[PDB]
Amino acid sequence: LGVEGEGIWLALGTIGMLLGMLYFIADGLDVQDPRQKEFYVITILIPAIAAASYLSMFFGFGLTEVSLANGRVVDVYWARYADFLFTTPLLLLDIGLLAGASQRDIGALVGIDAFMIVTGLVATLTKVVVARYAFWTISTISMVFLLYYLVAVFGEAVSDADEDTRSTFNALRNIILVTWAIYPVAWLVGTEGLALTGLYGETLLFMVLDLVAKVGFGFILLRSRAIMG
Amino acid sequence: LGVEGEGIWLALGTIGMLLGMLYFIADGLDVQDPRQKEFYVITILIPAIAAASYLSMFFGFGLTEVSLANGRVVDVYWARYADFLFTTPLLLLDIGLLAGASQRDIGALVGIDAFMIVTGLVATLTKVVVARYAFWTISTISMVFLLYYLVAVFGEAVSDADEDTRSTFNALRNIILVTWAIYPVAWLVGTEGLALTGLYGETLLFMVLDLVAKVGFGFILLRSRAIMG
Numbered sequence: 001l002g003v004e005g006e007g008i009w010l011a012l013g014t015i016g017m018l019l020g021m022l023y024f025i026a027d028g029l030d031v032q033d034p035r036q037k038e039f040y041v042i043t044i045l046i047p048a049i050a051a052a053s054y055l056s057m058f059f060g061f062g063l064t065e066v067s068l069a070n071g072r073v074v075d076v077y078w079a080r081y082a083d084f085l086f087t088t089p090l091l092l093l094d095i096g097l098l099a100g101a102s103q104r105d106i107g108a109l110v111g112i113d114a115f116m117i118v119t120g121l122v123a124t125l126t127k128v129v130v131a132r133y134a135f136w137t138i139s140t141i142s143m144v145f146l147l148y149y150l151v152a153v154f155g156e157a158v159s160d161a162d163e164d165t166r167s168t169f170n171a172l173r174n175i176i177l178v179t180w181a182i183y184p185v186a187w188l189v190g191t192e193g194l195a196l197t198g199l200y201g202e203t204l205l206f207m208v209l210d211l212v213a214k215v216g217f218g219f220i221l222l223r224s225r226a227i228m229g
Numbered sequence: 230l231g232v233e234g235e236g237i238w239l240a241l242g243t244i245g246m247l248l249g250m251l252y253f254i255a256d257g258l259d260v261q262d263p264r265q266k267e268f269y270v271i272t273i274l275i276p277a278i279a280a281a282s283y284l285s286m287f288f289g290f291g292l293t294e295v296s297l298a299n300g301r302v303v304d305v306y307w308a309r310y311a312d313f314l315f316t317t318p319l320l321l322l323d324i325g326l327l328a329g330a331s332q333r334d335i336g337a338l339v340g341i342d343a344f345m346i347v348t349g350l351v352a353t354l355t356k357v358v359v360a361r362y363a364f365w366t367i368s369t370i371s372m373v374f375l376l377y378y379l380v381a382v383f384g385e386a387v388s389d390a391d392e393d394t395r396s397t398f399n400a401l402r403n404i405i406l407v408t409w410a411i412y413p414v415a416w417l418v419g420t421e422g423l424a425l426t427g428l429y430g431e432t433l434l435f436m437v438l439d440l441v442a443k444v445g446f447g448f449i450l451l452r453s454r455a456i457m458g
């Protein structure tokens with residue numbers, strides 16, 4: 001299933017996201033506190049979007065071909081990018097609200113994030129080889145500014161909170177730092193880049209990163225005392 | 230010895246380089262073949278430059294302080310970068326000549342290498358924290374292009390040679406791939422970056438990488454039948 005058997009990872013991704021979503025829905029039933037309810041809506045939406053993306057890729061809706069200037073043809077799962085465009089801002093929104101960061105601060109970070117994702121999409125769609133890597137590079141650079149500001153700006157914002165909140169912040173921050181940094185690598189090593197691995201390994205890698213960065217993150221956030229329970 | 234005891238590694242580094250150099254000088258006494266003599270000159274120079282660098286660091290000549298924008302002070306062994314500027318191109322020259330790569334091909338790679346090292350130095354010197362990581366990233370990116378071209382371009386160039394040469398090429402190539410890739414990590418984790426380890430462990434790690442990448446590499450190259458023609 002798929003082009004070279006990567007269907008299994010799409011199915012598992014769909015399953016992981018679907019069940020992560022339902023779990024988050026279930027745990028949010030009791031909640032009436034408006035702030036806590038916002039956290040829930042955000043964190044439910046993240047795996048929902050990802051579920052829809054995974055589901056569509058599994059059936060082949062989010063897949064296209066790109067002929068490069070050097071003749072090589074790349075299978076591009078563009079739905080991934082549609083996923084990223086929406087879920088990563090929500091993720092920043094989630095940790096922002098937890099951090100007590102200002103609307104200005106969150107917006108700024110969402111901007112950089114959008115640049116990151118879109119530049120990535122541009123990199124993936126470009127048929128000129130050097131340009132692919134130039135876009136990928138620009139994107140990776142902007143990811144660094146993003147991660148830096150997450151640490152410095154969101155970190156500053158949370159610093160007046162109690163030890164429990166700051167501790168949850170650091171844990172989520174660390175999930176972002178580690179897993180987000182691997183995304184550009186996955187692209188570099190997979191079929192969109194150097195093609196050191198095929199579609200099968202690339203999809204597996206994205207699936208793990210996706211599950212950790214969304215379901216795992218969501219889990220840590222919703223079970224924290226910081227969101228009031 | 231040093232800021233926190235790392236003097237021992239500087240001494241050992243100096244010693245390793247010095248004796249690797251002398252070993253290479255000794256083995257080169259017999260050689261008259263002009264090609265083989267070039268390999269010798271290049272490979273002797275590498276540990277000589279590194280010896281000088283280690284020696285100067287040991288006495289404290291290659292050490293400076295950098296106040297960051299956030300107040301933190303970094304002890305920077307800048308001599309390391311002066312070392313890298315000269316030795317890494319010579320290393321590329323060494324494997325290039327063995328590979329039968331054209332002068333244009335070697336030049337191109339030396340260019341990327343110089344970009345790598347200088348961007349690294351810039352990363353290490355910058356007082357603006359974001360910029361540190363952005364430069365580190367750009368450097369690491371260019372290292373990837375370097376290693377890619379080493380594998381693809383030098384690999385192509387050697388492909389018409391006999392199995393013995395190709396085999397020596399792969400071994401040297403593999404030493405570069407493995408050990409060079411650790412350098413940015415050492416920086417990331419050490420006092421110049423996240424500071425998860427201190428000067429003592431950083432210096433030890435640099436020392437091992439340096440000894441393998443220079444003395445070990447040199448040894449493998451000079452004892453090969455490939456250079457003896």
Ligand SMILES: CCCCCCCC/C=C\CCCCCCCC(=O)OC[C@H](O)CO
Binds near residue numbers: 053056062064083
């Ligand atoms: C280039 C040629 C391609 C051929 C065209 C075939 C049509 C594909 C359509 C949909 C599946 C992929 C879209 C799924 C996107 C991820 C989920 C998502 O974004 O869901 C909506 C979201 O809630 C909004 O904010």
Ligand SMILES: CCCCCCCC/C=C\CCCCCCCC(=O)OC[C@H](O)CO
Binds near residue numbers: 188366370
């Ligand atoms: C193989 C292809 C290469 C792919 C390229 C991936 C590079 C992205 C990784 C890390 C960037 C660092 C961003 C994190 C910024 C650190 C913020 C900071 O200030 O950290 C210091 C800390 O305060 C003191 O411990």
Ligand SMILES: CCCCCCCC/C=C\CCCCCCCC(=O)OC[C@H](O)CO
């Ligand atoms: C492959 C190479 C690996 C070799 C690695 C060698 C590690 C150093 C060994 C022993 C002394 C450190 C043990 C003590 C713990 C460090 C902090 C400390 O208090 O050090 C006291 C020091 O001996 C001042 O009196």
Ligand SMILES: *C/C=C(C)/C=C/C=C(C)/C=C/C1=C(C)CCCC1(C)C
Binds near residue numbers: 087120180184214
């Ligand atoms: C649930 C999805 C998550 C957490 C996605 C994160 C995605 C990225 C951080 C993507 C980064 C990329 C680059 C920095 C370079 C170009 C390719 C990208 C888009 C994969």
Ligand SMILES: *C/C=C(C)/C=C/C=C(C)/C=C/C1=C(C)CCCC1(C)C
Binds near residue numbers: 316368409416439
């Ligand atoms: C004898 C010394 C050798 C072979 C050194 C090689 C050095 C590198 C490949 C260094 C790479 C770095 C980065 C990719 C970014 C951070 C700073 C550097 C310069 C350590």
